[PDB]
Design a protein around this ligand. Structure first.
Ligand SMILES: *[C@@H]1O[C@H](CO)[C@@H](O[C@@H]2O[C@H](CO)[C@@H](O)[C@H](O)[C@H]2NC(C)=O)[C@H](O)[C@H]1NC(C)=O
Ligand SMILES: *[C@@H]1O[C@H](CO)[C@@H](O[C@@H]2O[C@H](CO)[C@@H](O)[C@H](O)[C@H]2NC(C)=O)[C@H](O)[C@H]1NC(C)=O
Ligand SMILES: *[C@@H]1O[C@H](CO)[C@@H](O[C@@H]2O[C@H](CO)[C@@H](O)[C@H](O)[C@H]2NC(C)=O)[C@H](O)[C@H]1NC(C)=O
Ligand SMILES: *[C@@H]1O[C@H](CO)[C@@H](O[C@@H]2O[C@H](CO)[C@@H](O)[C@H](O)[C@H]2NC(C)=O)[C@H](O)[C@H]1NC(C)=O
Ligand SMILES: *[C@@H]1O[C@H](CO)[C@@H](O[C@@H]2O[C@H](CO)[C@@H](O)[C@H](O)[C@H]2NC(C)=O)[C@H](O)[C@H]1NC(C)=O
Ligand SMILES: *[C@@H]1O[C@H](CO)[C@@H](O[C@@H]2O[C@H](CO)[C@@H](O)[C@H](O)[C@H]2NC(C)=O)[C@H](O)[C@H]1NC(C)=O
Ligand SMILES: *[C@@H]1O[C@H](CO)[C@@H](O[C@@H]2O[C@H](CO)[C@@H](O)[C@H](O)[C@H]2NC(C)=O)[C@H](O)[C@H]1NC(C)=O
Ligand SMILES: *[C@@H]1O[C@H](CO)[C@@H](O)[C@H](O)[C@H]1NC(C)=O
Ligand SMILES: *[C@@H]1O[C@H](CO)[C@@H](O)[C@H](O)[C@H]1NC(C)=O
Ligand SMILES: *[C@@H]1O[C@H](CO)[C@@H](O)[C@H](O)[C@H]1NC(C)=O
Ligand SMILES: *[C@@H]1O[C@H](CO)[C@@H](O)[C@H](O)[C@H]1NC(C)=O
Ligand SMILES: *[C@@H]1O[C@H](CO)[C@@H](O)[C@H](O)[C@H]1NC(C)=O
Ligand SMILES: *[C@@H]1O[C@H](CO)[C@@H](O)[C@H](O)[C@H]1NC(C)=O
Lengths: 419, 271, 216, 49, 50
């Protein structure tokens, strides 16, 4: 690593920085509000009676937390196919509101409910707009409609030349007599009732069995979100590097117990620069502290490739109990500036060679090993000062010393347009 | 810049090798600070010790010499100075200095014991013992006042010096705000670091200042554009901080060179 | 008559705990030393403009000042809010009511056409309220604790904490108080800048304006 | 940068707080020049004639 | 679109060149200070006695 960083095949005695290490995370945790208001969908699908196709029933629903996965896996439906929206993702979307349309159709009219389609009820009873609708759910109802249902309680409208606009109900019961020239040239005759009855019999087939049908249309991005899908949760752990959510505020760190006191209305504290420091979860309503996971750069102390081929590894500013060959290694020496591994420790003290920090340094100088010691400021002596004693030199030596001072450097110019 | 995100690292690795430059500059200034302290303080080749008995012709240095009673072996004025002046989130670290406080105190005590017992001869060879009175005689002879003056008015000089040192101790103890320069240096450093970490939460023209939400909210096609804007903003801010640090380091280096010259000239000799 | 608002009208803007930090906020508040239109409805409730959230006050500790009616037409044409009390709990309904000239309330109801939402919740004592509206969120703050710093005047310093937040999303430009059958300040809010000091427990202890005086 | 504009100030305040440190540095150098002149020239306590 | 690509190249290279010239100015100032110290030492300790 040192050779890669220095980009050379020879290195000199000293300390170098190679890279940095960061503790890897672990399993994630997610928390969410404790209770969820269940949307009353039992009265929608398990309804006593559904009106006729020309007078189908409306419902507006919002401010709900309803799970659709618990309904998709249900096999009590003749057909459950949805348009443009993946049902498996319905738990990860939020909508302004939802509109439910309930009615009952015949067995062979299932294909008539689709955008851009042609048919009697498709264009004259309920026209689906030329855009995305939520989707249609249909299920058999011969148990409750083809056996004990009303003989003519279910009706359709055989009124033509009045192609209805999308989301339009014409419940006006008017006898269809034109009263003008284009009906046998007579007024009053050719009068046919706009409505007609379904023909159903006990076990009459497949295309005549009445089917209960609900059409769901979701309004998206038209207003602030009001209805959303429920989200699961999990348990928590302590004293481990974890990535967490806590109701929306994702972050990585280690969890601890805190003594801080929140007022009954805050959500999460901080200290400065948006750095979250304390969070409180809804299920337990307990305040807890967040501490960033440990990290830091590593360094290598080497005596030079020319001399030998052994190094000592220093981790900077980390409690060396959890560093994870260098997972157990040689004698770990924890100092004030991290921990040093690969070198021995002595109580002796000599001159400093390769500075490290915190008043200690490592070298091989006072067998064939690196030793880290506490540097010594120099020799030690005392002079016997007394009030009537003097010391006068008698011999002298002249010496020569050398000093080097730079005075100049290279003069360069850089072209602008060419470069 | 990235905060452990794959796409941020992928986008960042194509901008060149500016990080090598930033790390090299920071390591250079750190080594400069270490060598600067080493040069300003380490000026002796031994560590002298004061004799157990003290009779300096009437003077009283008890308030300057180190006190063994204190665990740090620091004199009274040192304690007053330390007690007077007062002062790792997202990838920032503070390395510890090479020389701790105890070795600095030992160096200062060595310098002071050498300048008391020996005078100026301990800076030009081997230290030579010399009585204190016959050192003030030489120092008076230096400035043109003949040495006959000192031996005739020794008690007055001792009393004046003791009164002056008591006065200076009282002035340091009572009047605060006499240590402005160090306080300003510390405050400027803290303010620069604090504003650098504050600049991280700014929007910088993107949809939001949080990278995880912006990556998980939209599809890549505009996500790389938003991430690019955030990256370039943060990089420019970091560059500004580095330049400010370089300027301040150069200024401190000049001031410390002046201090080293003053110490080497006035302490070890006569000016 | 008119009254001077010394220091009233500072509240918690967000829901973030903080400690020993001097935090500068840029949010629409009540300017210090402002004018408030004191009323004297004793032996009269005129109509007032809304103008982006209003202060409110009172000083009577009995069951007279009961209801708030909000809206822009005060008819069944447009939905009208209604906040009242029946000695135990509070109802909030965005359903439509017809006009009331002299409604009487205390321990009015005209029609319920297009009723869509419902909500149920829980020196004298002065009850401060602040009504705010931001992007379809209607916020109601409250304070029910008085300070006897001076007599006959509400001078001192106090904060406000949110209690009701409603994601209804309607635009209101008119509001009236309601009484029974047989005295309150009003102020407006402006987008000023404030500096807030937090206590060790996270409670506001001192607020200073940023656009009042050179010293400020 | 803006010159008496409304939305331009809105975009400018979104970029952070550069102007704070810019003005701080400029005021610092101005005060430094003032102290510099005072220190180089004012070297006596009395005035002689 | 070629102009967009050329714009990106230009802004990147301009930033790099600005950084280089700023570093160069700092280094030049430091070397000038050292040279002034050397000139003082030469003029004082050689032509006379210190
Ligand atoms: C209509 O009722 C049936 C019967 O209750 C519901 O089917 C599930 O029935 C089991 C056993 O009775 C219950 O434990 C489940 O809770 C029922 N499902 C759900 C989603 O509640 C059926 O779901 C009902 N139809 C609805 C709710 O639309
Ligand atoms: C949040 O929901 C959980 C689970 O329903 C509640 O935890 C239970 O609370 C009851 C209270 O009597 C205890 O008897 C149970 O032992 C608890 N179960 C667990 C697994 O902790 C909790 O009380 C709810 N908290 C709130 C504020 O609603
Ligand atoms: C690394 O962490 C350990 C904790 O596992 C620290 O151990 C402490 O040891 C002292 C002395 O016995 C105890 O008084 C503390 O209570 C221990 N800490 C804890 C959290 O219990 C150890 O000191 C740490 N190392 C460094 C260098 O900080
Ligand atoms: C001058 O005399 C003093 C005191 O007699 C000497 O100091 C001691 O000298 C002896 C020599 O046997 C050493 O063992 C002691 O360690 C010295 N004491 C201290 C405190 O260092 C001093 O060495 C003499 N000077 C010379 C040049 O001989
Ligand atoms: C001062 O020291 C010098 C050497 O540092 C002494 O000169 C040496 O004297 C010895 C004995 O006569 C010779 O063997 C060496 O060859 C000499 N060395 C040199 C370099 O000339 C000198 O004698 C000393 N003077 C006194 C007065 O002690
Ligand atoms: C030298 O000065 C010290 C000042 O620290 C003197 O110590 C003080 O002496 C007075 C007089 O008795 C006491 O009241 C103080 O409590 C002492 N201070 C301390 C810190 O001990 C010391 O007496 C002086 N000695 C000489 C010989 O002048
Ligand atoms: C902050 O909250 C605490 C506890 O809720 C309040 O209680 C005081 O806390 C301090 C700190 O330990 C104690 O010294 C007091 O004796 C406590 N007083 C009482 C009556 O319990 C405290 O009053 C709140 N405010 C402040 C400023 O601390
Ligand atoms: C290796 O180091 C030794 C001692 O420092 C030296 O004598 C020798 O020349 C060095 N070898 C090389 C190839 O530099
Ligand atoms: C230093 O001495 C102490 C005290 O005897 C001992 O416990 C310790 O192991 C010694 N250190 C080494 C490196 O031998
Ligand atoms: C309201 O403002 C007017 C000035 O426009 C002032 O004269 C009057 O005293 C104010 N009312 C108060 C302070 O109650
Ligand atoms: C008002 O009184 C009626 C009478 O019982 C009660 O139903 C209603 O709940 C009261 N108001 C509120 C807000 O609860
Ligand atoms: C109720 O509101 C709806 C809007 O969804 C409107 O179509 C209808 O006419 C309203 N009812 C009355 C009686 O005004
Ligand atoms: C806002 O007010 C306008 C009237 O100016 C109204 O048309 C609009 O519906 C209101 N918006 C909401 C969300 O109520």
């Amino acid at each position: 690593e040192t050779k890669c960083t220095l980009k050379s095949f020879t290195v000199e005695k000293g300390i170098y920085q190679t890279s940095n290490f960061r503790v890897q995370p672990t399993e994630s945790i997610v928390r969410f509000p404790n209770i969820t208001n269940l949307c009353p969908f039992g009265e929608v699908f398990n309804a006593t009676r559904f009106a006729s196709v020309y007078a189908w029933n409306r419902k507006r629903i919002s401010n709900c937390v309803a799970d659709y996965s618990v309904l998709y896996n249900s096999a009590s439906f003749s057909t459950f196919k949805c348009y443009g929206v993946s049902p498996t993702k319905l738990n990860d979307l939020c909508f302004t509101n939802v509109y439910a349309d309930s009615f009952v159709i015949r067995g062979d009219e299932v294909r008539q409910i689709a955008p851009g389609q042609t048919g009697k009820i498709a264009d004259y009873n309920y026209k689906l707009p030329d855009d995305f609708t939520g989707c249609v759910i249909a299920w058999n109802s011969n148990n409750l409609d083809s056996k004990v249902g009303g003989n003519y309680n279910y009706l359709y409208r055989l009124f033509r030349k009045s192609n209805l606009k999308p989301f339009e109900r014409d419940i006006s019961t008017e006898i269809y007599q034109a009263g003008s020239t284009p009906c046998n040239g007579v007024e009053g005759f050719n009068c046919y009732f706009p409505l007609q009855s379904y023909g159903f019999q006990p076990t009459n087939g497949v295309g005549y069995q009445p089917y209960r049908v609900v059409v769901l249309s979701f309004e998206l991005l038209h207003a602030p979100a009001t209805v959303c899908g429920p989200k699961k949760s999990t348990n928590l752990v302590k004293n481990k590097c974890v990535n967490f959510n806590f109701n929306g505020l994702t972050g990585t760190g280690v969890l601890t117990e805190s003594n801080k006191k929140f007022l009954p209305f805050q959500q999460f504290g901080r200290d400065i620069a948006d750095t979250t420091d304390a969070v409180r979860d809804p299920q337990t309503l307990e305040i807890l502290d967040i501490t960033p996971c440990s990290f830091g750069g590593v360094s290598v102390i080497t005596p030079g490739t020319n001399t030998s081929n052994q190094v000592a590894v220093l981790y900077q500013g980390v409690n060396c109990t959890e560093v994870p060959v260098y997972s157990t290694g040689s004698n770990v020496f924890q100092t004030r500036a991290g921990c040093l591994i690969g070198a021995e420790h002595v109580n002796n003290s000599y001159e400093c060679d390769i500075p490290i920090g915190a008043g200690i340094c490592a070298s091989y100088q006072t067998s064939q090993s690196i030793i880290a010691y506490t540097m010594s400021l120099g020799a030690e002596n005392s002079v016997a000062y007394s009030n009537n004693s003097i010391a006068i030199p008698t011999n002298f030596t002249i010496s020569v010393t050398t000093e080097i001072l730079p005075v100049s450097m290279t003069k360069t110019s850089v072209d602008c347009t060419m470069y | 810049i990235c905060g452990d995100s794959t796409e941020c690292s992928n986008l960042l690795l194509q901008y060149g090798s500016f990080c090598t430059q930033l790390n090299r500059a920071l390591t250079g200034i750190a080594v400069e600070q270490d060598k600067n302290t080493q040069e300003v303080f380490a000026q002796v080749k031994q560590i002298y010790k004061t004799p157990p008995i003290k009779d300096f012709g009437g003077f009283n240095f008890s308030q300057i010499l180190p006190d063994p009673s204190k665990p740090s072996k620091r004199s009274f004025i040192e304690d007053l100075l330390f007690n007077k002046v007062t002062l790792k989130f997202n990838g920032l670290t503070v390395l510890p200095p090479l020389l701790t406080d105890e070795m600095i105190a030992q160096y200062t005590s060595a310098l002071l014991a050498g300048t008391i017992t020996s005078g100026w001869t301990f800076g030009a060879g081997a230290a030579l013992q010399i009585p204190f009175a016959m050192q003030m005689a030489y120092r008076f002879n230096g400035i043109g006042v003949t040495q006959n003056v000192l031996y005739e008015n020794q008690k007055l000089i001792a009393n004046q010096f003791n009164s002056a040192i008591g006065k200076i101790q009282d002035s340091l103890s009572s009047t605060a705000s006499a240590l402005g320069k160090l306080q300003d240096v510390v405050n400027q450093n803290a303010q620069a670091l604090n504003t650098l970490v504050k600049q991280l939460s700014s929007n910088f023209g993107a949809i939001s200042s949080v990278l995880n939400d912006i990556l998980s909210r939209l599809d890549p096609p505009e996500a790389e554009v938003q991430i690019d804007r955030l990256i370039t903003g943060r990089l420019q801010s970091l560059q500004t901080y580095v330049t400010q640090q370089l300027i301040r380091a150069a200024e401190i280096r000049a001031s410390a060179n002046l201090a080293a010259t003053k110490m080497s000239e006035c302490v070890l000799g006569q000016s | 008559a008119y009254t001077n608002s010394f220091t009233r009208g500072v509240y918690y803007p967000d829901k973030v705990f903080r400690s020993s930090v001097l935090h500068s906020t840029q949010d629409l508040f009540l300017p210090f030393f402002s004018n408030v239109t004191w009323f004297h409805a004793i032996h009269d409730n005129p109509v007032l403009p809304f103008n982006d959230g209003v202060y409110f006050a009172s000083t009577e500790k009995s069951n007279i000042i009961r209801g708030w009616i909000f809206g822009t037409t005060l008819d069944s044409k447009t939905q009208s809010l209604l906040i009242v009390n029946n000695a135990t709990n509070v109802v909030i309904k965005v359903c439509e009511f017809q006009f009331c000239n002299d409604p009487f309330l205390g321990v009015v109801y005209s029609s319920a056409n297009n009723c869509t939402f419902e909500y149920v919740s829980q020196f004298k004592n002065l009850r401060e309220f602040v009504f705010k509206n931001i992007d379809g969120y209607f916020k109601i703050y409250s304070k029910h604790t008085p300070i006897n710093l001076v007599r006959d005047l509400p001078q001192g310093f106090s904060a406000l904490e949110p209690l009701v937040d409603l994601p209804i999303g309607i635009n209101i430009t008119r509001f009236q108080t309601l009484l029974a059958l047989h005295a309150y300040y009003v102020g407006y809010l402006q987008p000023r800048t404030f500096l807030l000091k937090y206590n060790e427990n996270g409670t506001i202890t001192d607020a200073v304006d940023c656009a009042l005086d050179p010293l400020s």
